[PDB]
Amino acid sequence: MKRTFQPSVLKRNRSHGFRARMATKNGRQVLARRRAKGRARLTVSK
Amino acid sequence: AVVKCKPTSPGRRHVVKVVNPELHKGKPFAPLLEKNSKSGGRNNNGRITTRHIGGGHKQAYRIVDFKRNKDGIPAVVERLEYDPNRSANIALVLYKDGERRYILAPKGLKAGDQIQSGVDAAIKPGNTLPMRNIPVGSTVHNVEMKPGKGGQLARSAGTYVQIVARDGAYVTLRLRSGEMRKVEADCRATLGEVGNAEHMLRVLGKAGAARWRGVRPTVRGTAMNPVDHPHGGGEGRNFGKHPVTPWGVQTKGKKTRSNKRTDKFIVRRRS
RNA sequence: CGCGGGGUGGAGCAGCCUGGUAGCUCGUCGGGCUCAUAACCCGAAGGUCGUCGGUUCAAAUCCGGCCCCCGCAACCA
RNA sequence: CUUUAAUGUUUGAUGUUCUAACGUUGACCCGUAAUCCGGGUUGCGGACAGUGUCUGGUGGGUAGUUUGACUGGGGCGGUC
RNA sequence: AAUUCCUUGUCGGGUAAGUUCCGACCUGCACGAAUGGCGUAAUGAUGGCCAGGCUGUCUCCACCCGAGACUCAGUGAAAU
RNA sequence: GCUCGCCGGAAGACCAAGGGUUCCUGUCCAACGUUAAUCGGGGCAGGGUGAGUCGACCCCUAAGGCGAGGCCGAAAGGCGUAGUCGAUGGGAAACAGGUUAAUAUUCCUGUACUUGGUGUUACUGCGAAGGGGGGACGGAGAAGGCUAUGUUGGCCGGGCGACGGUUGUCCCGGUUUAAGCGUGUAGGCUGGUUUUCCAGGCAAAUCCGGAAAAUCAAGGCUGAGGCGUGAUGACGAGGCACUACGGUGCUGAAGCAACAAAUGCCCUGCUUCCAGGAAAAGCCUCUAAGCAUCAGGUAACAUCAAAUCGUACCCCAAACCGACACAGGUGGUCAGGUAGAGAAUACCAAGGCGCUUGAGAGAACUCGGGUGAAGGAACUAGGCAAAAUGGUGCCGUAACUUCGGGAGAAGGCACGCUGAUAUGUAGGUGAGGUCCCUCGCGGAUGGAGCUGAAAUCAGUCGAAGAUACCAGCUGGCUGCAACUGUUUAUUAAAAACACAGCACUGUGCAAACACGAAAGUGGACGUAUACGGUGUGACGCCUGCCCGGUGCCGGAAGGUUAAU
RNA sequence: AGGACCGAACCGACUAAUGUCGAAAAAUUAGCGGAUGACUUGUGGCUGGGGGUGAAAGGCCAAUCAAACCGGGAGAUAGCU
RNA sequence: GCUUGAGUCUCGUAGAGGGGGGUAGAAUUCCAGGUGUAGCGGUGAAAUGCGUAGAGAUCUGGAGGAAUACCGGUGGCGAAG
Questions:
Q1: Residue B171 forms beta bridges with which residues?
Q2: How big, in percent rounded to 5, are the helix, strand and coil portions of chain B?
Q3: Does the keyword Disulfide bond apply (chain A)?
């Protein structure tokens, strides 16, 4: 079968990146919530 | 010239190709081309507005000047080019001053003729001039609506506009549909009929003959499920609903024209 | 088994609904027109209102039992 | 009172024309190397068009919903 | 008949025997002309039927070759 | 270590992606591995990735995204211009050999190349966000010319051989060499050169385009490969020498010819058909606002810089994605010998592995298969399954048909090995010799050597000669659908959808329609031979009656009738 | 020339068998259809929940679809167990 | 060879001979405006149809398609149509 996860960091960072979230208001809510729970990994980035 | 091919395979047996031995088999003029990357019916919001469009072949757009603003200077037709975007052809025309431009290809026009743009033009098919200097009952095309737009009406294969009367500042036209409308008489119209008048007789043949052009399979509503199309559902092709569009509005009988801003200029209408 | 409707001169249909009088066309009989027929014209007759009972001043009519006839339904696991 | 006549007056319903609202996804110039936009001339329409409030009609395109019970299983017929 | 309830309708052909198939009869419960009608060469991992070749499908199984089953040593689940 | 067995267009050799040290050495065996384990992609410590030419970053853009103003919208925000990002695209430059336990076009040796800064000398007009050329281009087919590469001959080195012959037309191994520069071939394209004029290129222009004439017939541009140079170099079979017994040190002959020949290159070609096949910059060229004893530009030369990150290993898998060391999935490239049309298939090469449970037994039964007397669909829902047909050349081939088919119809025939025609032919390739010559990578003539079908006859052998793998079951009646194609990923692949074609109808451009509160896009940078919708569904012979009810179009006098 | 024919790579998925606590949450073996096109796939962006997409099945939208996933209304409500 | 067959050349004559492209007027239908009023149309008679939403009739202008009055004659022309 062809699995539902063919990883590609170029494509992965364009979507779920730090700046991609920081770009819009809806995304800015996410960084707020993530930091609200005290989650060490705020987003997917090295 | 129209030619009917021979059945060497299922699907080829119904093709008829309009072949032009006069059309230049080389390459079009360089400075008059630009990219015209497809859309597929999408808009700014990325949603499909118009159905059955997308895919197909890639075509380069030829920027053709419908204006005919280079006044008076005589021009010579160098070569006829095949235009993928229009049903008509395009002629590589060179003026006397040393300028190359594309224009539409009128009917009785061959390579090497002489044309001109302006009120000083003689009555010869291919010449573009204001409509108040043209005899009534003429046969023209590429007619404008504003002094400078470029030309809107009669811009496809084998279509010809008939001027009925020239009463005052307005000229009564009898369009291709049969609708008669008055327009500002100072709008330039190109004499004669447009060529490529065999385009109508072209029968595609294959399903791809329509596919590589740019269309998509038009799905009938009665095959769909009622949630999708206003028609649909049932067990064994059932119907009963009055024919409508996939958005509810009535089709097969309902005049949707309602502008009123241009209703004033319109005299008669298609019956 | 159940629901709705029907049965009327020889034939096909009204009138029933809202009860006291049964009409129309064709057919039948008689006469006339033509040499004769058809056709047409004139005149007259013919109906237990399917059957029985009940209610009633009055019943083809309203109700019910039965016979005949037609349409419809006779289902899902 | 009924039928009617001229004038004044009172608003209203058509028609034609005009320019100043407005439109202009017409041409040219500038801000500007920018086909978006604005501004300025001008040409074409023109008190329409279009928009806002109110109003009738159409309206499954869309939405929230109703669609009885008894019942010798439920439907059906019957009934309350 | 992708349509015929009664129906395996009736006749003829095909098998020794044919509720399917084929050609017809019209008595079409309830075909029908762009919710297309009647035909049609080629095409079809399509549906139904028959003939030939061919065979263990079957008549009726037998033997043989390998992987498990079985035994030994090691490890070591599951539904209930 | 010696045999055996498997893949070998892969189960091999390398890149991208993605992982994130899994790479190497020493050491250890609790836990991990479906068993043991002194073993390992496991634990522990240490070691390992070296760049001006590869990639990324950089310069330049597509789809598309963000988007100063601005337009729009309850707010958020939406759209979009100038701009600015965004490769899978374009653009400057390296090949060969050697080495480490592990990296190397990165390190060493040898030999070259590119783009800029700066300075001197000799000359000279340079100069933009502006203009032109260029970059720059489709599918398919065919032919010629080559190379990669293989076969073979010759040559050199070694051998002459544990059962029979084997100094012979004998056996084994090697017989490799780049980038760059020079030459500019086969071949491709285009007529060159000069003067003048010009409402064209938002300005200018000597550049480009156009119109006149003058002159000559070539010039110019491009271009694989070959040949020299690179290289009296390197490498190099195999010996001579030391073995911590892993390998190191040293030396080292031959190194050419011929034929066959690609899907690589020529080809970003040529021909042809049509559905008519990115953009921008680098690069080259011309001028403007101007600057001109300048500044800069062109050629040669001296010299300096070329920074930063990535680089180990896996990449058809015990390391990526599948919960697992999972019979699955994963883009691109190289891809030998024999038979063969072939990248199929059978066996082999370089190379890599025997799949992480094994030893016995030979019961029923089950799975994967072999063979099968007599019969041959009697099986069964049904010829499901198996069986069988299966290649090339030639002969032959019906009803019907849209005149292409049908058809590879059906049905048959000939194939092996040796000799001969011919100490291997037709044919292909093609040196030496000769002559000519606008003299070279040239042209005719010449034909050895090399290579090599098919055909006919004759002879021989077995049961069988397309001997294996590989490799059609055929025909007839008939329903549906024209046909290719698409579809329920994970029970339906069909008669369903689609389809070109037909018809009615909507739409005169700020088009109808659709998305969107709107602006603004799409429709279309199209305009009635055009666009949206519905219905039917190739082609052929046709397409009969009804406007009652419903829907819709046209006409509005009257009646009815809202806000006001 | 061909939505041409036979047939690998590639795509797809008709039959049978094994499998059904499988080697695997649709695969393996043996045969299959397409294989110059309406072909195929890589890289990369656009379209989004009554919306998207759709050669139309109510199939597809991260193993989930006649209205996805996550959180919040919410300890929804229950004449039901 | 000849020339009376047949055929060519030099010059004129009559003709709806044939094909292509233009153009004119009458008449009919429809369309727009104005005048104007209950019939119009039709047949043996009648009726369908048209009409007070204003036809027919009459005037003005226009859009369109086909056929060519009188000339026209048992005239001409053509192989025939």
A1: B183
A2: 5, 25, 70
A3: no
Residue B210 parent element (H or E): helix B208-211
Nucleotides of strand F within 7 Å of the protein's CB atoms: 17-19, 62-66, 76-80, 87, 132-134, 137, 198-200, 209-210, 272-279, 320-322, 328-330, 402-404, 482-484, 489-490, 496-502, 504-516, 519-539, 551-554
Topology adopted by domain B195-271: Ribosomal protein L2; domain 3 (4.10.950)
- Specify burial of residue B36 (Cβ count, 10 A radius: 0-12, 13-18, 19+): middle
| Resolution at which this structure was determined, Å | 3.8
Please calculate the CA angle B50-B56-B62 and round it to the nearest 5 degrees.
Answer: 90
Chain B residues 59 to 98 whose Cβ lies within 7 Å of strand F are 59-61, 63, 72-74, 81-82, 84-88, 94, 96-98
CB B109 within 8 A of CB B77: yes
In B112-224, DSSP assigns E strands to 114-115, 128-130, 139-141, 161-165, 170-174, 182-184, 188-191
Domain, as residue range, for A9:
1-46
**Distance in angstroms: CA B42, C1' G78:** 48
- The architecture of the domain spanning B1-113 is Beta Barrel (2.40)
DSSP letter for B162, please.
E
User: Which nucleotides of strand D lie within 7 A of protein CB?
Assistant: 26-28, 43-46, 48-50, 59-62
DSSP for A1-46, written as a single string: ---S----HHHHHHHH-HHHHHTSHHHHHHHHHHHHHT-S--SS--
Query: Where do the structural domains in chain B lie, given as residue ranges?
Result: 1-113, 117-194, 195-271
Domain count, chain A: 1
Please report, for the domain that includes residue A7, its CATH number.
1.10.287.3980
Give bridge partners of residue B170 from the DSSP assignment.
B184
